[PDB]
Amino acid sequence: SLEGKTIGITAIGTDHDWDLKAYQAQIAEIERLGGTAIALDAGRNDQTQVSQIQTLIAQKPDAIIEQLGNLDVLNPWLQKINDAGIPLFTVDTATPHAINNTTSNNYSIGAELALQMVADLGGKGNVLVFNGFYSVPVCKIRYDQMKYVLEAFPDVKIIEPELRDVIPNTIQSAYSNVTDMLTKYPNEGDVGAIWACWDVPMIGATQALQAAGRTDIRTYGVDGSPEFVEMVADPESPAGAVAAQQPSEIGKLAVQNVARHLAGQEVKPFTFAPAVLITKEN
């Protein structure tokens, strides 16, 4: 099925749980179908990824799977994969350069999470927003849907400015930012929710609110990282909801889009894995 084939994987990291799950699932599926995997990990360095792409181009695999990262940086190099005549597949990276993008429904996810947040707020209150990854396609969608939904609720507002969630030291940088913002806004109704396009900073934000003794603010994020899920399920914790994805499914499905294409078969422009919203009572 991939028996005489070599598939390159280029991911920007395996630093955290979702990324590691997706990356491992790709490798496992390539080998399962009888293929050879050339697995490259950029260690959250963009310039590393660039040269890792160069490597893959020069190694001439039967196809390349690209995972996450900044689109604007990648674009000319993605173009050169097309120039080399190598089939390109992505996980999460929504680009015209790809035959297929395997991912989740970030449009529904983005909306439902935002809707849950305003439901929990009861249609009124202010929202602290971490928006440091907007150049990543899925976070662009997740942010856009949140902001669109909030247009309908004039008493639900995003506080200025938006904070920048970062890699590395994500959790502590978020914890420190939230602490700053609780100092700036101490009163019992000034801030009511905290949002990010992913789980990991919300782990920190929750820890900070807990340490501040604030039971009145809830946090919201996306991925379903075991630490944030457990916080959502805990009734003592201010973690409010999480969009739980299936990275292991996403990685698996991307490889069979590759395997389908190489067997001369029709592949759809995208493939969604399912995701659920998980809230405190649900």
TrEMBL record:
Subcellular location(s) per record: Cell envelope
Q: Name one Pfam family in it.
A: Peripla_BP_4
Write one Gene Ontology MF term.
carbohydrate binding
Record keywords, A-Z: Signal
Q: Which residues form the Periplasmic binding protein domain?
A: 7-266
Instruction: Report disulfide bridges, numbered on this chain.
Output: 139-197
Tree of life domain: Bacteria
Its Gene Ontology cellular component terms are: cell envelope
InterPro entries, alphabetized: Peripla_BP_I (IPR028082), SBP_2_dom (IPR025997)
Q: Which family does it belong to?
A: Belongs to the bacterial solute-binding protein 2 family.
Q: What is this protein called?
A: Monosaccharide ABC transporter substrate-binding protein, CUT2 family
